[PDB]
Amino acid sequence: SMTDEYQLYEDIGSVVRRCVKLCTGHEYAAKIINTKKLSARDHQKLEREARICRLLKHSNIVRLHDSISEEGFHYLVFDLVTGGELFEDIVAREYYSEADASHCIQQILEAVLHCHQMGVVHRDLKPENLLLASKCKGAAVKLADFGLAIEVQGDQQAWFGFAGTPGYLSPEVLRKEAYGKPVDIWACGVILYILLVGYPPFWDEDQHKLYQQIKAGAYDFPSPEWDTVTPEAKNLINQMLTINPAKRITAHEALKHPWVCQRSTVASMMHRQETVECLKKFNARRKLK
Ligand SMILES: CNc1cc(Nc2cc(C3CC3)[nH]n2)nc(Nc2ccc(CC#N)cc2)n1
């Protein structure tokens, strides 16, 4: 079926291959899941991801086109978005300000709010899952990869397990405590910090040491580079990177923050060349692991 209706080409970003639907000619992105030796637990996980990806239709989340079960393999076929990773586009721009970073985080927070309204916690918000719709200027930021996503019942929090990328892990996950939606907003804080200065709030070559920093919530806003960053941006990072998840800002409240919703008057329009140059180094460091 899928082997008669599509043609598969190169691996994108399970394997994820760019494909073309033969009858229409349009391009897609197929997540190819080998299901021959799958434990019962993992069949439920894959059913769940498919179900999550069908449920979530939003301007800023990559859309599922189809879900195709075959012998040995399952295919989740998504719309192809062709603008690449957000962070790789930012380093290529002539102008980059807080206003631009506010615009990105706004779109990301709209994606996260929608997941959270639908009962979905992504659990692996990181740069590689933030894609641009196209190479056109002002292309939407789109959230990808719900591989690690879970379904929650309302605001019911629980220990769902370790999942996610070290630098973006929340304190409550690292303390092996009950968590839920707030872990996504922590990750969004970490992304926002990198979006403003081009390096992470938490870093250590030793990861046990990194996890201690995160559990402590020990970041700061060093001079000189944070000296020019508006206090309203720093305020928002502080509300997202709050260690107590009950006190942490929600996606709904974060979108009502003035730096996000009154960007044209609150966020700095000043070019931040040093950010762009740190991002370049950041991007280089990550594509080496
Ligand atoms: C040009 N640069 C790109 C393009 C691209 N195209 C995509 C991917 C998708 C859905 C995620 C399957 N739609 N369009 N994906 C990526 N990265 C990427 C990120 C996550 C995944 C895994 C998932 N889900 C696969 C690829 N980098």
UniProtKB/Swiss-Prot annotation:
Subunit-level organization: CAMK2 is composed of 4 different chains: alpha (CAMK2A), beta (CAMK2B), gamma (CAMK2G), and delta (CAMK2D). The different isoforms assemble into homo- or heteromultimeric holoenzymes composed of 12 subunits with two hexameric rings stacked one on top of the other. Interacts with SYNGAP1 and CAMK2N2. Interacts with MPDZ. Interacts with FOXO3. Interacts (when in a kinase inactive state not associated with calmodulin) with ARC; leading to target ARC to inactive synapses. Interacts with CAMK2N1; this interaction requires CAMK2B activation by Ca(2+).
Family named by the database record: Belongs to the protein kinase superfamily. CAMK Ser/Thr protein kinase family. CaMK subfamily.
Modification Phosphothreonine occurs at: T275
BP GO terms, sorted: cell differentiation; long-term synaptic potentiation; nervous system development; positive regulation of dendritic spine morphogenesis; positive regulation of neuron projection development; positive regulation of synapse maturation; protein autophosphorylation; protein phosphorylation
Protein name as it appears in the record: Calcium/calmodulin-dependent protein kinase type II subunit beta
Active site: D124 (proton acceptor)
Gene that produces this protein: CAMK2B
Role played: Calcium/calmodulin-dependent protein kinase that functions autonomously after Ca(2+)/calmodulin-binding and autophosphorylation, and is involved in dendritic spine and synapse formation, neuronal plasticity and regulation of sarcoplasmic reticulum Ca(2+) transport in skeletal muscle. In neurons, plays an essential structural role in the reorganization of the actin cytoskeleton during plasticity by binding and bundling actin filaments in a kinase-independent manner.
Region of interest: Autoinhibitory domain: 271-280
